[PDB]
Amino acid sequence: PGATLCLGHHAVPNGTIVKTITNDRIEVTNATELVQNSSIGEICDSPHQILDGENCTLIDALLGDPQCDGFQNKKWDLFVERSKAYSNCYPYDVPDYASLRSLVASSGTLEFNNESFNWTGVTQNGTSSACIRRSSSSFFSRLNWLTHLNYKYPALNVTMPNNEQFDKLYIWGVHHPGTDKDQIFLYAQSSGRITVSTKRSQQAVIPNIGSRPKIRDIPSRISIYWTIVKPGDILLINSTGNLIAPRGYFKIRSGKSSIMRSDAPIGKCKSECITPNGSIPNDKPFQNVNRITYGACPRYVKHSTLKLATGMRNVPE
Amino acid sequence: PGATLCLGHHAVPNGTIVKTITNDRIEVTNATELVQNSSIGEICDSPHQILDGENCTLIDALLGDPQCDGFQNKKWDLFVERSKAYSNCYPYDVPDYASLRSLVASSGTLEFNNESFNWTGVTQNGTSSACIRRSSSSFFSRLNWLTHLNYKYPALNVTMPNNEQFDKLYIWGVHHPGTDKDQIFLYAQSSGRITVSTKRSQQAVIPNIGSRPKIRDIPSRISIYWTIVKPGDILLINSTGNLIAPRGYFKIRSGKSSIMRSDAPIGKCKSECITPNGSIPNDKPFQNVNRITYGACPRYVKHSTLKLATGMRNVPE
Amino acid sequence: PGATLCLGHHAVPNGTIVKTITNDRIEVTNATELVQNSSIGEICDSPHQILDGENCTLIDALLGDPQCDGFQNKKWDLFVERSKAYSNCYPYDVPDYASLRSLVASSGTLEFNNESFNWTGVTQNGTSSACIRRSSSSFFSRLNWLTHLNYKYPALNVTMPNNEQFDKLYIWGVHHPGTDKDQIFLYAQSSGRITVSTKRSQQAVIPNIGSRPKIRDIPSRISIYWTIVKPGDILLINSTGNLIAPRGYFKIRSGKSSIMRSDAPIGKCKSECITPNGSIPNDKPFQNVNRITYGACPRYVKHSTLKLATGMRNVPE
Ligand SMILES: *[C@@H]1O[C@H](CO)[C@@H](O[C@@H]2O[C@H](CO)[C@@H](O[C@@H]3O[C@H](CO)[C@@H](O)[C@H](O)[C@@H]3O)[C@H](O)[C@H]2NC(C)=O)[C@H](O)[C@H]1NC(C)=O
Ligand SMILES: *[C@@H]1O[C@H](CO)[C@@H](O[C@@H]2O[C@H](CO)[C@@H](O[C@@H]3O[C@H](CO)[C@@H](O)[C@H](O)[C@@H]3O)[C@H](O)[C@H]2NC(C)=O)[C@H](O)[C@H]1NC(C)=O
Ligand SMILES: *[C@@H]1O[C@H](CO)[C@@H](O[C@@H]2O[C@H](CO)[C@@H](O[C@@H]3O[C@H](CO)[C@@H](O)[C@H](O)[C@@H]3O)[C@H](O)[C@H]2NC(C)=O)[C@H](O)[C@H]1NC(C)=O
Ligand SMILES: *[C@@H]1O[C@H](CO)[C@@H](O[C@@H]2O[C@H](CO)[C@@H](O)[C@H](O)[C@H]2NC(C)=O)[C@H](O)[C@H]1NC(C)=O
Ligand SMILES: *[C@@H]1O[C@H](CO)[C@@H](O[C@@H]2O[C@H](CO)[C@@H](O)[C@H](O)[C@H]2NC(C)=O)[C@H](O)[C@H]1NC(C)=O
Ligand SMILES: *[C@@H]1O[C@H](CO)[C@@H](O[C@@H]2O[C@H](CO)[C@@H](O)[C@H](O)[C@H]2NC(C)=O)[C@H](O)[C@H]1NC(C)=O
Ligand SMILES: *[C@@H]1O[C@H](CO)[C@@H](O[C@@H]2O[C@H](CO)[C@@H](O)[C@H](O)[C@H]2NC(C)=O)[C@H](O)[C@H]1NC(C)=O
Ligand SMILES: *[C@@H]1O[C@H](CO)[C@@H](O[C@@H]2O[C@H](CO)[C@@H](O)[C@H](O)[C@H]2NC(C)=O)[C@H](O)[C@H]1NC(C)=O
Ligand SMILES: *[C@@H]1O[C@H](CO)[C@@H](O[C@@H]2O[C@H](CO)[C@@H](O)[C@H](O)[C@H]2NC(C)=O)[C@H](O)[C@H]1NC(C)=O
Ligand SMILES: *[C@@H]1O[C@H](CO)[C@@H](O)[C@H](O)[C@H]1NC(C)=O
Ligand SMILES: *[C@@H]1O[C@H](CO)[C@@H](O)[C@H](O)[C@H]1NC(C)=O
Ligand SMILES: *[C@@H]1O[C@H](CO)[C@@H](O)[C@H](O)[C@H]1NC(C)=O
Ligand SMILES: *[C@@H]1O[C@H](CO)[C@@H](O)[C@H](O)[C@H]1NC(C)=O
Ligand SMILES: *[C@@H]1O[C@H](CO)[C@@H](O)[C@H](O)[C@H]1NC(C)=O
Ligand SMILES: *[C@@H]1O[C@H](CO)[C@@H](O)[C@H](O)[C@H]1NC(C)=O
Ligand SMILES: *[C@@H]1O[C@H](CO)[C@@H](O)[C@H](O)[C@H]1NC(C)=O
Ligand SMILES: *[C@@H]1O[C@H](CO)[C@@H](O)[C@H](O)[C@H]1NC(C)=O
Ligand SMILES: *[C@@H]1O[C@H](CO)[C@@H](O)[C@H](O)[C@H]1NC(C)=O
């Protein structure tokens, strides 16, 4: 009579197709997806400190456009710039805009310390109807539009030492008036010149008078520049007109801070990984949601799906 | 008596040596090469639309050097620049030449639309004996050399709105005459100034008078600049002399177009992959022909040969 | 009675833990480390030709700061810049400093050939008390500070052809004096202008008069520029004041030369691979000593240890 003893393995009714080195379609008992392909559609506000820029670019929060006053001295891990953002102050450009945005985003703070420059022989606090703060002609909060006093603009030659233990970031500008009349009306002479220097750097700018296409009726422009002053170094601002002066300095830190362009809403939840589409889970090693990421994120790949086998070959019958 | 039954495998007289993880030389029955190591020596004219630059660089076809007139309004997938190319018009330089070449190559068209600027109070259509078109002093086809009329050069302040649905690329320049005599002879005053602006950009250039080493007897130079004008934006050209003006705009597209330096002839054949050496087959995943490629190409590697085993270990006797 | 024959394998009392695809800790009989994690703490002077910069940056050895006179005409495979380096000549900056440093480091030579420019109508060999050579006011060895002769500075317009078979690298500058008095005291007129050109390039610089913060009592600055002249091309130096002129050219080679910042001492020993920490052995394929390397080096990785099994699984008892 005897007996029979059969050795065997399980199978399932609902197997999953995976790829191998030798077969592009083979059925296994179970698999798990390694490419995260979805976001929750919102940026979770923990654990990273998120600053929603709302109507303001980071640079407009830096300069101090009036709609951005609530951003003064704020800090962030990630600044979120919205596509609806708009400027509503004096028209300006920034040569190497991208670099200024980057270095400020990376620093993660708009901490600003006022300094007294002793501007002697000029009118301070120039305003404009293109920059309205509380129904009143105004200007960039962190900039000081210096004009003539008594049809005189004497040569400024001003020193600000850095006696602190941290670096200072000075933001300043140069006014390019629309016509020759304006050049005289504000600075009482035809040729501006600005030199901003330290021991190790010098930035000399000549204004360029003329019409640019009008933005809120203004054919003139301000061009923005920046200067970092190390401890033991000295800012030296030598100018004879057309200086849009600093009111102080920004702290410049190094850390983990950045900036991202997104229109996703901010939600009350926890997620380590942020993309412009929203936060994504980070269990999986890869993702195809967005090449732009911040935090502990799966690596971006161009595959919609990669299934890792977690069981044997499925052999029904 | 009984029988014998032997199990076995084939072998071949002409095996091939491959590399493995454990052995750098092992013989298998057959292998296939994964590194493409040869080109046909010519650039196949299908499936990619090839434009042979012949004696012309892309920038000379853009500006409109007289030998390049046949390139007006042409389109390409790949522009091929030959090493025999030479310029034969007024000497010029392009600050950030590489970027202009790149953006035009990438756009893939020299489609040009003429516009009427209404230059009032200046002579248009200045010519030079260094730029000969049909045995006649001439100039860049797409540029307009403006000089004085009646020893007067009044301040130009000219607007061209972009009311189209596509971007416009303006190419223009600044004449740097050789001596002070020339500055007066052409512009009837000593100091040129050019400002070209949009709502968002401004490019201000001062000419610089003096001798550069002569090229076809010319110690003067033109410097070339470009300006992109978006829909709803406005070009504004404010100048008091030394303007080499645009006659219109180039369409600027985005697509799959590029440029390549090669001396390989163009042939009538089909090949997806182009290198400077010529077209290469793209069956193999890798190639060692050239790091420069266009199209569906094997990836460049620093290996002359990589043989993939396609059979068992070859064990003769 | 019969016999027993047992098949088996060795084991050791002192096994080593390795990682596999399926197990992060498994014991094998032996392993070898693939990440080099230590340096000898000194830069071996063979087989690479090492030039210890000591108190001198490469740029100070180029210009010819007096403490760097021993570097004249030296060659290197690797120039080593020390953190104690300091400048002790006239204060200067170099726009795109990084690029000048790179191209000279890569060239691997300070071979300098004097040329006669025939400076006619100017005083040559201007000196300064900020640049002391042998207890005597002096200047950069490779630069020629041209000032007025008899309160006249006539317009220089000087040509130097390259009739050699190699490229020439010209280094030159522009003096930015501290005040308007100085501008007259040295150049006997208010407006300098410098144009340096070749057939294919032009560099026009305007000086900018004013105070920068003093360095060894000097509020003025020299700005350094460079020009490469190919065979058959011509240097043309057109200037009306404020030219810090070249005394000749540097040979510019291409080869395997570079530069490294390190404070490690130089030792008498042989090692193919150099890092800022010192030379490292290059038997192993990887290293975690430094991302900065020169020579035949293991590849930098972010792992402290990677043990490759060199024996079977160790199964004691
Ligand atoms: C150089 O030319 C430009 C272009 O014409 C001049 O700027 C233009 O000035 C006019 C006159 O004020 C502006 O027109 C006005 O527009 C407003 C806005 O809707 C409207 O309310 C008025 O009825 C009038 O049409 C126009 O905006 C402006 N154009 C641009 C592109 O900025 C400029 O004045 C000239 N330069 C000098 C120094 O005059
Ligand atoms: C600044 O100096 C330069 C260099 O000497 C002057 O340019 C030179 O001008 C001469 C005189 O016309 C040119 O010489 C001629 O060359 C042709 C070409 O083969 C030949 O047919 C003539 O017999 C004569 O030798 C020379 O080409 C030219 N050199 C360079 C490098 O461009 C320049 O004129 C001076 N600046 C001013 C404003 O005068
Ligand atoms: C523009 O303003 C600056 C800043 O005040 C002026 O430069 C400064 O000039 C003074 C006077 O010589 C220097 O002070 C001296 O310092 C030395 C060094 O220890 C000391 O021995 C003297 O007793 C005296 O205190 C000062 O160094 C210098 N400051 C800087 C930052 O460079 C400059 O002179 C003004 N511009 C013009 C054209 O005058
Ligand atoms: C198929 O395999 C996956 C991965 O092994 C299983 O998913 C895990 O399930 C456990 C429950 O025991 C969870 O705690 C884990 O979070 C899951 N891991 C992952 C990576 O998702 C899944 O349960 C398996 N399915 C079956 C039917 O056994
Ligand atoms: C996440 O956002 C990206 C970027 O917006 C989305 O990818 C874009 O999708 C649009 C329209 O669907 C395409 O026209 C673009 O070409 C895509 N951009 C890129 C860079 O590929 C993406 O679909 C979003 N993903 C998820 C899961 O929401
Ligand atoms: C050695 O192996 C290669 C690859 O398997 C064979 O080359 C293929 O041959 C077929 C003919 O049946 C062609 O249609 C394919 O285009 C070839 N493939 C490649 C990648 O070249 C080759 O024939 C084999 N040699 C022998 C003797 O069997
Ligand atoms: C394809 O073209 C390249 C570039 O011309 C060739 O590689 C060069 O060959 C020359 C002389 O034979 C060498 O001096 C260069 O160093 C090579 N350049 C590079 C970048 O490596 C290459 O041999 C050609 N290949 C084929 C198959 O024709
Ligand atoms: C453990 O394995 C390593 C690598 O196989 C052995 O190290 C080698 O030892 C030989 C001596 O026969 C030396 O010549 C080599 O330079 C060593 N190679 C490396 C990469 O270090 C080691 O000896 C083995 N240990 C034992 C006990 O067998
Ligand atoms: C080799 O040198 C590097 C660079 O100096 C050392 O790494 C730095 O160590 C300091 C202090 O120990 C840290 O503050 C830095 O963050 C490190 N720099 C980087 C870029 O990581 C390194 O320890 C040295 N390695 C050895 C083996 O000596
Ligand atoms: C942003 O700007 C829009 C349009 O001007 C305005 O209606 C809205 O209230 C602003 N929102 C914030 C948060 O400032
Ligand atoms: C200018 O404005 C600043 C900042 O608000 C203020 O402290 C100061 O009173 C004003 N100064 C002058 C000179 O009007
Ligand atoms: C500041 O520079 C201007 C011109 O750049 C000059 O007139 C003035 O003397 C300088 N400052 C002083 C007070 O020296
Ligand atoms: C290109 O230039 C050469 C030399 O000037 C000339 O002989 C040739 O005909 C030109 N070829 C074309 C296609 O324009
Ligand atoms: C200048 O040349 C253009 C383009 O060929 C032509 O349309 C026009 O007739 C000329 N204009 C003047 C003012 O001579
Ligand atoms: C154009 O600019 C010049 C100087 O830049 C100026 O004289 C002129 O007024 C400007 N155009 C007009 C007509 O306003
Ligand atoms: C380098 O400079 C220091 C400090 O001035 C000096 O004491 C030392 O002798 C110098 N060393 C060399 C090698 O020039
Ligand atoms: C200037 O110095 C150079 C280099 O030391 C020397 O050859 C020459 O004699 C001097 N020239 C004049 C004009 O004083
Ligand atoms: C050199 O340039 C200056 C102004 O840039 C000019 O006055 C002079 O004529 C030029 N050289 C000569 C001798 O032509």
Author numbering:
A (entry chain A), B (entry chain A), C (entry chain A): 9 to 325
Which statements did the authors publish about this structure?
Since entering the human population in 1968, H3N2 influenza A virus has evolved extensively, especially in its hemagglutinin (HA), due to selection pressure from the human immune system. The HA glycoprotein on the viral surface is responsible for cell entry and is the main focus of the humoral immune response. The HA RBS is a shallow pocket on the apex of the HA1 globular head, and is formed from four structural elements: the 130-loop, 150-loop, 190-helix, and 220-loop, named after their location on the HA primary sequence. The HA RBS engages host receptor sialylated glycans and consequently is relatively conserved in sequence compared to the rest of HA1.
We further examined the structural basis for the loss of E190D reversibility in recent H3 strains by determining HA structures of HK68 E190D, Wy03, Wy03 D190E, and Mich14. The Cα190-OH98 distances in HK68 WT (Glu190), HK68 E190D, Wy03 WT (Asp190), and Wy03 D190E are around 9.0–9.7 Å, whereas this distance in Fin04, HK05, Vic11, and Mich14 is around 8.5–8.8 Å. The Cα186–Cα228 distance in HK68 and Wy03 is around 4.5 to 4.9 Å, whereas in Fin04, HK05, Vic11, and Mich14, it is around 4.2 to 4.5 Å. HK68 has a Ser at residue 186 and Wy03 has a Val, whereas Fin04, HK05, Vic11, and Mich14 have a Gly. The presence of a side chain at residue 186 may increase the Cα186–Cα228 distance, as well as the Cα190–OH98 distance, and reposition the 190-helix further from the 220-loop. Secondly, lowering of 190-helix further entrenches Asp at residue 190 and disfavors Glu. For HAs in recent human H3 strains, lowering of the 190-helix further entrenched Asp190 such that D190E reversion completely abolishes receptor binding and viral replication.
